[PDB]
Design an enzyme around this catalytic site. Structure first.
Site, PDB file in Angstrom:
ATOM      1  N   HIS A  50      31.138  48.709  26.505  1.00  0.00           N
ATOM      2  CA  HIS A  50      30.919  47.407  26.981  1.00  0.00           C
ATOM      3  C   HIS A  50      29.426  47.263  27.510  1.00  0.00           C
ATOM      4  CB  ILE A  94      27.566  48.020  37.232  1.00  0.00           C
ATOM      5  N   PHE A 138      15.336  36.492  31.715  1.00  0.00           N
ATOM      6  CA  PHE A 138      16.411  37.569  31.764  1.00  0.00           C
ATOM      7  C   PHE A 138      16.666  38.010  33.498  1.00  0.00           C
TER       8      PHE A 138
END
Lengths: 161, 161, 161, 161, 161, 161
Positions: free
Chosen positions: B88, B82, B113
């Site tokens: 990051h 998120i 994935f």
């Protein structure tokens, strides 16, 4: 507590498919989708038993024989009803819905509903292209879950023996 | 023609599961999704190897070990990214993608994935309680199909020998 | 002078074809074109090797296997990426571009790029009919030339010996 | 099923700390933060190994040796990238991030990013005090976690053998 | 001090030339300029190895073979990328840069970069006349100097031996 | 606590120098900049090794040669890139940037980035001047500190034995 359900492996199972041939443009779509999910979920196709019939009316009569062979474990209903002919849609769709119901309760064998009741032929031109929302795909899956279920139900019946 | 495709029976396979614990309100949700499709596609649940780690960063360094085991046929990537700190999300999400990829090419081993790129947390809450939209279910599936495809690739090699 | 090139005959050759199944509307159309050029340009289809996979992500890992078999001379990479999800078209498409690249350079085996980047289904239909623009057709051609070229490199290596 | 995660006691472990000497104003605050949680989560500090270097550039090459010792278990990374010089900040921050990422995968030894990316001296001072955000602190924490997780990994393999 | 640099005599040297035939109207212009400067600086034109490929993409995989010959001392990269397809100019051109880079670093054998990056075709034609911006002229010359340099490097090792 | 750092005494070290001769208007200045800081920090110059190449492009392949010799402890990158062409400044600067980096992690040998990336010719006049910010002066010193450091690392390993 003891839980019963079916995994989706199509291994060791022999399937039944009945199909109308009214509206065959979309029926081509459904038969594929079912047969795939069979074989890609491990099912070998040599034991899929497939019957064509003319119209929606004759779906019961045929399934009735198909479920009565010993070696058909589950039978997949396939028929298409677009609102073409209204008395034949209300009465025949409810009569086939019920007809199948009694076949299973009586024969003790699962019968799936891959019957596309499209109010609107516009929904049919959507999946005839490439969309995966393939009612044959998914009713075929439910038949596997039932198939392994009664394989699992009646296996714990006769192996505990 | 020689056609190789993946059939979806999880029978006899030993899975690898790598999980982040950042945002675990939904990661618990996804891992469930994977384990369900696993066993309910016939695979056993004793040979699943599951590992958790702090955040998405060490996802790679994890799978780098799991994939080097001879008795794990596929590794499933799990994490939730998120948009929390943009250094990051751009750089770590890109390093996850690129990093997992190079492991897969290198070990010759299918790595899936299952990373949910949601923009916010409310989308993460919605999907963990309103629909079967479960990216874990689905990355669980693709590694199954790859598991049988590669076991189809290399086993068509090894028995034909 | 000594000049090396490759004619357009597919005779004596064994190819690889890797296929995604996302947007399969267009994949049917392009693999068709690809197999048109091989068999029409001198190849027999008995050694065309067709491996299918889920989505664009798993393309690399497959071809890397098709290239490690002795008797695959060239692999025709084929998939469709459409601008769905900007995370997946940017990072996944460049990871295919790069991933295939370092495959061939490492393995010393030609792998060609039949990846149609299109924005609309209508751009796919245009190229499917008769406009001589099936990009898989072209990728099949480029790989033929590279195959016979590397057969021209490697064979002028071992015969002069 | 087998689960692996990571406990926070640093006993039996020997760490690597690599640190830049550029901007050491805030670096002093982190080095203490790092050796803080190491000694304080049970580790003795005599087996902490501290390598100082010029600027954020030399960070990788040093860590490369630290992880190449047998009796160094984890290599915590300490450097500061304040937006001083923008080509050195984007190019060297992503190259440190990448260069470290590959180090961990290659040597199969956990490496932690205790690198504070600050756009200002104000953001650097705030978290360097006692506000729960001394990035060295959490870097050393997740590093201990992977130390006991990896010792849980390979020692659960070597001891179950 | 021990210093190494190369003279430009082409005598005793056997060269590599790889050529894309995408945009051949100027490509012929280039290789002419290339072999020109090679032969004028005293080297015989029968030791030239010239390889032809379709478009810019295969440029790598060709050279990778050319270098693995024991008897090609250096290889001259030659191709033209005009902005035709911008996804193909960003990914293919940069991948040409990196791919050639890493082959040279890997094989420890130099590969020059005869790459003309023109936006307009007129800026190409203007630069092949007598001022010798005939980028091939120069990429050829760089290859000579590097050729004699590594023959200067490794030969100051093997004759001092 | 075990600490490693480096004094700056260049006694006992043998160095590597690679220099581009593109825009030698600044390269001569830096080259001397490094040699100065070397010998004026005690190091002899009969052990320095200088290699010259055409342009920024070739610096990678050369350092890879220099670092592989047994008797070179540290290598000094040297070049100036002026924004001549954006294909060549963006790609060649980042490609050599990362390229040198991966050499060092790979050969386990320290490389300083002795590059002056000037966006303008004026920034090129500032950094080769009097203020003793002669990039060669500096990157030479970083190399000595890293030279005595890895001599401190590997010495505190080899002699403790």
């Amino acid at each position: 507590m003891e839980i019963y359900e079916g995994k989706l492996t199509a291994e060791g199972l022999r399937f039944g498919i009945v199909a109308s041939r009214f509206n065959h443009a979309l029926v081509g779509r459904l038969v594929e989708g079912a047969i795939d999910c069979i074989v890609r979920h491990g099912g070998r196709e040599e034991d899929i038993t497939l019957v064509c019939v003319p119209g929606s009316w004759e779906i019961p009569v045929a399934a009735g024989e198909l479920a009565r062979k010993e070696d058909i474990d589950a039978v997949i209903a396939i028929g298409v009803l677009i609102e073409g002919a209204e008395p034949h849609f209300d009465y025949i769709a409810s009569e086939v819905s019920k007809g199948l119901a009694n076949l299973s309760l009586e024969l003790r064998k699962p019968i799936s509903f891959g019957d596309i009741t499209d109010d609107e032929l516009e929904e049919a031109i959507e999946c005839a292209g490439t969309e995966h929302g393939n009612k044959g795909w998914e009713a075929a899956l439910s038949a596997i879950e039932m198939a392994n279920l009664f394989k699992s139900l009646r296996l714990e019946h006769h192996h505990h023996h």
